[PDB]
């Protein structure tokens, strides 16, 4: 199928972004009827929730990196 940008955006899985976009009453009533769960995949939902967006330094690929010097690493190795 092919749909314009507005209709493609309004058909997303996340009810938070769709509700904050346009046609708020329709999105909200459909989501409430369906009992939809928002998994917080995109950026707007995380911004609305005041969380760390899954991009840049907030990406799971990089945000768990640790840093340590050689002296402490050697001490842990002896331990």
């Amino acid at each position: 199928l092919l749909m314009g940008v507005t209709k493609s955006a309004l058909s997303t899985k996340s009810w938070l972004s769709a509700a904050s976009f346009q046609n708020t009453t329709h999105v909200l009533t459909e989501a409430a009827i369906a009992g939809k769960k928002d998994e917080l995949i995109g950026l707007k939902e995380n911004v609305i929730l005041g969380r760390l967006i899954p991009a840049g330094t907030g990406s799971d690929f990089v945000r768990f990196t640790q840093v340590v010097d050689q002296k402490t690493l050697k001490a842990i190795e002896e331990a």
Partner: protein, 93 residues
């Protein structure tokens, strides 16, 4: 531009990983009052005021300098966090 930014960007596969490493190293330096630094006393970042040269209070510059020096090891799943912090406190109170 920050000195040696090109090398720092080439030292990592992703720039956000470099940013995370720099921020975490800066936090570690700030928490212990710059007593855990790996820089020699003549590589120390200086700042010039009327009274004289003192230590640079900005920890991010310290982190960039140490990352440039290459004496820091960084990666994923190196050491448990609790043990890491305890050992950090052991070497540098």
């Amino acid at each position: 531009a920050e000195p040696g930014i090109d090398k720092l960007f080439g030292m990592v596969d992703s720039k956000y990983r470099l940013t995370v490493v720099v921020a975490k190293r800066a936090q570690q330096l700030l928490r212990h009052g710059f007593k855990n630094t790996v820089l020699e006393p003549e590589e120390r970042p200086k700042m010039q005021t009327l009274e004289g040269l003192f230590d640079d209070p900005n920890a991010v510059t310290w982190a960039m300098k140490e990352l440039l020096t290459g004496r820091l090891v960084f990666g994923e799943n190196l050491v448990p966090e609790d043990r890491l912090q305890k050992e950090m406190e052991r070497l540098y109170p």
